[PDB]
């Protein structure tokens, strides 16, 4: 009568999204940390169920199909960005952040996640713990980070690191206070990057199971194998690290699920 869903194995190791989204200190805007996430299962539904984010604009992907399709590797970049600059994260945007701090290609896959962080990253006075690049002689290349401590120069004469006229420090400090406006509030933004290569993927996502049905002619689906029969135990003790059995006429006669490791005769 009904349909039994696929009995994929137990929940394996989870991707470290807890420490990414709840770290006690985030990296600077110019010195943004680069982290690679792989060899786990990705679950974006649990983060979306709480819904603490005010930005969900994504191009090329959909939240419903995130659990179906998957890529080779996941890259995470976490750094504090105010909402004005946040609205500027789109690839079709220009400015100081989009051309001197971070760059996104036109064919970028994925999007970023931003949420309000007015409580954290602030004190009674102005917080000067975060800096950003302001002056550059050329457009920033996509997907790369440059950390230069040299004194930026604008005048014809060169200055040897002094703080004189026509040349100053390119980096500038932030001012985070609780009395600032909504648009000047400091938000915590994490970049979710997706890259697809010719190599097989290593992180896609987990899956659930259903209730057992016995002594009934109910169609099944075990590890992507479709068939009809009655699920009943037997005495066919088999060797481990196998998926399913067969017969002379290629018809499946036994399959084990990675939950109880039973016989589960097909017909």
């Amino acid at each position: 009568p009904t349909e039994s869903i696929v009995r994929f194995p137990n929940i394996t190791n989870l991707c470290p999204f807890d420490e990414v989204f709840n770290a006690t200190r985030f990296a600077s805007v110019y010195a943004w940390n680069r982290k690679r996430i792989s060899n786990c299962v990705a679950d974006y539904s649990v983060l979306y169920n709480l819904a603490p984010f005010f930005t969900f604009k994504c191009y090329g992907v959909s939240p419903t199909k995130l659990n179906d399709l998957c890529f080779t590797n996941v890259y995470a970049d976490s750094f504090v960005i105010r909402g004005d600059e946040v609205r500027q994260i789109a690839p079709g945007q220009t400015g100081n952040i989009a051309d001197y701090n971070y760059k996104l290609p036109d064919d970028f896959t994925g999007c970023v996640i931003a949420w309000n962080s007015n409580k954290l990253d602030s004190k009674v006075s102005g917080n000067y713990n975060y800096l950003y690049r302001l002056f550059r002689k050329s457009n920033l290349k996509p997907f790369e980070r440059d950390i230069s401590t040299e004194i930026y120069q604008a005048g014809n004469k060169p200055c040897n690191g002094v703080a004189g006229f026509n040349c100053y420090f390119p980096l500038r400090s932030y001012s985070f206070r609780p009395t600032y406006g909504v648009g000047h509030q400091p938000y915590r933004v994490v970049v979710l990057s997706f890259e697809l290569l010719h190599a097989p993927a290593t992180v896609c996502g987990p899956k659930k199971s259903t209730n057992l049905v016995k002594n009934k002619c109910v169609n099944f689906n075990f590890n992507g194998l479709k068939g009809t029969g009655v699920l009943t135990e037997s005495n066919k003790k088999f060797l481990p690290f196998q998926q399913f059995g067969r017969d002379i006429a290629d018809t499946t006669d036994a399959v084990r699920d990675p939950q109880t490791l039973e016989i589960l005769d097909i017909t």
Partner: antibody, heavy 116, light 109 residues
Framework: EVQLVESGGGLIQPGGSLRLSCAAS????????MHWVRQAPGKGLEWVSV???????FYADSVKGRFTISRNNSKNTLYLQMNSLRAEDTAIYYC??????????WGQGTLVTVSS | DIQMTQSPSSVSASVGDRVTITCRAS??????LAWYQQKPGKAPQLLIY???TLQSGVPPRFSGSGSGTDFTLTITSLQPEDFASYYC??????????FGGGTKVEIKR
């Protein structure tokens, strides 16, 4: 040691075009932020355009269209492109250089008038 | 988006007085304000930046302070040459400059 020379202003028809030149002596137009200001008579200042150190151009809400900036490194002079004018577009302007959120350099002023 | 208004319009004071020029902010912007002075028929000049620091060429008679929403331009000593309009300037994240009204300072006659 900083000086800015302005030229090209004058009386032109509203349905015409004008050439704006902003010359920098001790400054390079392709290495720092560029600022443009406007001031109609009888009132205060206003902002029309800002040119970045790269290929980024921004304009105000009233002037999103009909305005284009283009810098050249041949003679370190800035050129402004204009095709359309309004009745209130006549004002005084001072092309200038400055850092973020504040500017210190300033230039001279050439009057422009539009009438039929 | 952002609109800036100046409460004083025309204040009359002598040499031994404080102009008490203030700029009203609708939103919360602190320590990111600059004041500019222009003469009639002359180019404007910068006076202070970030509402706390003082320029090297500007004499230290000009003073300014403001935490989150209100700023002041109190001057220790007023000179006959230093009689001009003052404007409060606030920038945006895309370096969108905004200029409001001006206040002219004169002497009670």
């Amino acid at each position: 040691e900083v000086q800015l020379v302005e030229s090209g202003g004058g009386l032109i028809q509203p349905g015409g075009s004008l050439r704006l030149s902003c010359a920098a002596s001790g400054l390079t137009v392709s290495s720092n932020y560029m600022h443009w200001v406007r001031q109609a008579p009888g009132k205060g200042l206003e902002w029309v355009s800002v040119l970045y150190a790269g290929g980024s151009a921004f304009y105000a809400d009233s002037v999103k269209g009909r305005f284009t900036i283009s810098r050249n490194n041949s003679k370190n002079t800035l050129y402004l492109q204009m095709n359309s004018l309004r009745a209130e577009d006549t004002a005084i302007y001072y092309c200038a250089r400055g850092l973020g959120d504040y500017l210190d350099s300033w230039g001279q002023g050439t009057l422009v008038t539009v009438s039929s | 988006d952002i609109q800036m208004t100046q409460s004083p319009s025309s204040v009359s004071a002598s040499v031994g007085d404080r102009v008490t020029i203030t700029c009203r902010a609708s939103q919360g912007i602190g320590s990111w304000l600059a004041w500019y002075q222009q003469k009639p028929g002359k180019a404007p000049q910068l006076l202070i930046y970030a509402a706390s620091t003082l320029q090297s060429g500007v004499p230290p008679r000009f003073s300014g302070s403001g935490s989150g929403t209100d700023f002041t331009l109190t001057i220790t000593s007023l000179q006959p040459e230093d009689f001009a309009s003052y404007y409060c300037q606030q920038a945006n994240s895309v370096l969108a400059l905004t200029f409001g009204g001006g206040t002219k300072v004169e002497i009670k006659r």
